[PDB]
């Protein structure tokens, strides 16, 4: 009976709520009052990259903090030298509608995808002197929203059809899939150990998955609207998410509950991208109001504002070593802040 | 320094080549106009697409009018939700919206709601929408047959009066023209309530099998780009 199952679900949800409440004897905000505030943070654009024609939608930092990959809706994928601003490659994509890009941990492969439902992987070996498509991973029933590399042979991709899948580059077919979501999946983040990865969907719920076991482990909720971004805390025991409701929240896997939420009354625009510093003390989040903000994770106090962009800040990324922060926007320009 | 200079010169040469390629591609990118095709589920989008032409998530069609490059994209295998992937088409020259003038439900109300949502979107406020009222011939038969739909579900049609600005074609009775202009005014009310002035609507009465649809689209695009230029030069 549908009424019986839907009542058992309500009972289980109430029990889960009670269990979560029982563990909240104290709040992170109260305890953090003893921590010294970081104070105002000064950031300026040190390098500006130009060459894109359409709005930039995604970018990814390299593993050496030297090379980065930029994806634009023009259909061109460009790799830039951060220190010298010299372009190293210009890959003309088959489809102009791009929505994400990724850089392999070893730097030998680059991947991208979009509304075509196909994930294309490019090889930088260039034995013949040119970059060509290594393989295309078709099979998704919805637009590919985000993708990340576990290694040179394994890639995790997400699509706007409620399905997350793991692909084998050599064989070119899905190995396992996740179907716990109900709305379109917007972004995914891989844990430092690569064993676990989180994904956000357009239903205000964040799901935790096990790559090896291939099934959900924990479910997090609390957002008032769709989730647009997600990023793991550097220690890997927590992550932060951004949603259209203009409030960021931090979730802890061990506690199975949100520890703190970042919000400002004067801010009404939603969050587009989020990223943490090397130590995780500083949280950087992009906003639709043509600027980015830096949040003190422990005190929930805005320590600065980055307003060097003229249009929506679509992507934001922090180097592995934290030397500088690269941000992109719909004005076809990249701003690197240090 | 010699070893460092060896890499620096190669980097400079690569940058020069990439810059030349990007400059070459810029001309073709700027010389082509991007268009989005959208409409109801069972609308006549397919017939119009084939007329212009004569598992993938998106389809693209290329055509040229008066030596003007036109690039159009039709949404393919995509889920019913649109509030996320629609934001991508914010830089297109215009949005082509096709609604049938007739599992079936009150399609016209759903089309009105979808058009209002598209018009009121924050990122789409800078993009003009070209509106095509398709299946007008079927509307004529449905009106002349006695059995009626608009008069049943639309109550305001009874009190409606044909505008004096109407320019109906010969050989058609007052009823079909009145219904067509009532639908047109229903669309214009939503498209003009905001009064922002940044984007405008271009209604059209077109049949499924119509040869001059390409000319309609070309004229609308010319008008849109020209109006944008006048706005840029501070006139409008």
């Amino acid at each position: 009976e549908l009424d019986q199952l839907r009542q058992e679900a309500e009972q289980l949800k109430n029990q889960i709520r009670d269990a979560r409440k029982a563990c909240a004897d104290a709040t992170l905000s109260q305890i953090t009052n003893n921590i010294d505030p970081v104070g105002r943070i000064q950031m300026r654009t040190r390098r500006t990259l130009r060459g894109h024609l359409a709005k930039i939608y995604a970018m990814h930092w390299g593993t050496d903090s030297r090379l980065l990959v930029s994806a634009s809706q023009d259909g061109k994928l460009i790799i830039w030298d951060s220190y010298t601003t010299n372009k190293v490659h210009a890959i003309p994509l088959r489809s102009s509608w791009v929505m994400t890009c990724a850089y392999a941990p070893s730097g030998n492969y680059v991947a991208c995808g979009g509304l075509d439902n196909i994930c294309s992987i490019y090889n930088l070996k260039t034995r013949e002197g040119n970059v060509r498509v290594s393989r295309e991973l078709a099979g998704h029933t919805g637009y590919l929203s985000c993708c990340r590399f576990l290694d040179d042979n394994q890639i995790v991709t997400s699509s706007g059809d409620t399905t997350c899948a793991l692909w084998d580059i050599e064989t070119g077919q899905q190995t396992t899939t996740f179907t716990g979501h109900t709305g379109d999946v917007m972004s995914l983040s891989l844990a430092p150990d690569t064993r676990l990865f989180v994904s956000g969907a357009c239903d205000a719920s964040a799901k935790l998955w096990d790559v090896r076991e291939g099934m959900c482990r924990q479910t997090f909720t609390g957002h008032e609207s769709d989730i647009n971004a997600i990023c793991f805390f550097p220690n890997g025991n927590a992550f932060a998410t951004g949603s259209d409701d203009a409030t960021c929240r931090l979730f802890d896997l061990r506690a199975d509950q949100e520890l703190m939420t970042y919000s400002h009354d004067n801010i009404i625009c939603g969050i587009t991208s989020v990223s943490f510093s090397k130590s995780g003390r500083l949280l950087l989040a992009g906003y639709d109001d043509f600027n980015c903000n830096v949040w003190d994770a422990l005190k929930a106090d805005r320590a600065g504002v980055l307003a060097g962009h003229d249009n929506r800040v679509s992507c934001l990324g922090v180097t592995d070593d934290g030397m500088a922060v690269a941000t992109g926007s719909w004005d076809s320009f990249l701003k690197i802040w240090n | 320094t010699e070893d460092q200079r060896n890499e620096e010169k190669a980097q400079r040469e690569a940058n020069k080549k990439i810059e030349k390629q990007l400059q070459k591609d810029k001309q073709v990118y700027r010389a082509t106009h991007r268009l989005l095709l959208l409409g109801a589920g069972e609308s006549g989008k397919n017939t119009i697409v084939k007329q212009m032409r004569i598992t993938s998530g998106i389809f693209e069609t290329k055509f040229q009018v008066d030596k003007v490059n036109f690039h159009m994209f039709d949404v393919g295998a995509q889920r019913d939700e649109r509030r996320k992937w629609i934001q991508c088409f914010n830089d297109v020259t215009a949005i082509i919206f096709v609604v049938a003038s007739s599992n079936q439900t009150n399609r016209l109300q759903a089309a009105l709601k979808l058009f209002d949502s598209i018009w009121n979107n924050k990122w789409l406020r800078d993009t003009s929408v070209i509106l095509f009222l398709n299946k007008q011939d079927l509307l004529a038969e449905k009106v002349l047959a006695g059995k009626s739909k608009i008069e049943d579900y639309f109550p305001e049609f009874a009190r409606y009066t044909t505008p004096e600005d109407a320019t109906p074609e010969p050989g058609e009775d007052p009823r079909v023209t009145r219904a067509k202009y009532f639908i047109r005014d229903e669309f214009l009310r939503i498209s003009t309530a905001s009064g922002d002035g940044r984007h405008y609507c271009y209604p059209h009465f077109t049949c499924a099998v119509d040869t001059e649809n390409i000319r309609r689209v070309f004229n609308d695009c010319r008008d849109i780009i020209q109006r944008m230029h006048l706005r840029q030069y501070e006139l409008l």
Partner: nanobody, 128 residues
Framework: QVQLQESGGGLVQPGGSLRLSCAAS????????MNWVRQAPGKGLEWVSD????????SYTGSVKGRFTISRDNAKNTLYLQMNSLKPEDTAVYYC?????????????????????RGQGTQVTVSS
């Protein structure tokens, strides 16, 4: 978690009246637009009416314009849809759905057969 619960409704002879109430929780009810949708048997979802955040702007479908009425009270996070003069075609399951984003007048995926931000709904039936 955000949850929308519909209440009221039932079997009623034609020409009667019914009261439907929607309960909102887990979010700021005053910052989101509210909509009413129904799904008749053997037919897809269809929009019925919507009310702005402050209630100043109210609209109804032509088939129900002048018959039904909707109102909201942010002090209780409740939304209402008053039905009167029932007709045999009114039989349908009514869902209380919320506009996806706040501080905006655009709502896209209210009735796209998969909207997560809507309640379970209640059955409304009419018979002689």
């Amino acid at each position: 978690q955000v949850q929308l619960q519909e209440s009221g409704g039932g079997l009623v002879q034609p020409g009667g009246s019914l009261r439907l109430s929607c309960a909102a929780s887990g979010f700021t009810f005053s910052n989101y637009k509210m909509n009413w949708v129904r799904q008749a048997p053997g037919k897809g979802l269809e929009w019925v009416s919507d009310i702005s955040q402050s209630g100043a702007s109210i609209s109804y479908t032509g088939s129900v314009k002048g018959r039904f009425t909707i109102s909201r009270d942010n002090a209780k996070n409740t939304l209402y849809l008053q039905m009167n003069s029932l007709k045999p075609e009114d039989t349908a399951v009514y869902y209380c759905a919320r506009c996806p984003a706040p501080f905006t007048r655009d709502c896209f995926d209210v009735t796209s057969t998969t909207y997560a931000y809507r309640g379970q709904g209640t059955q409304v039936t009419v018979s002689s």
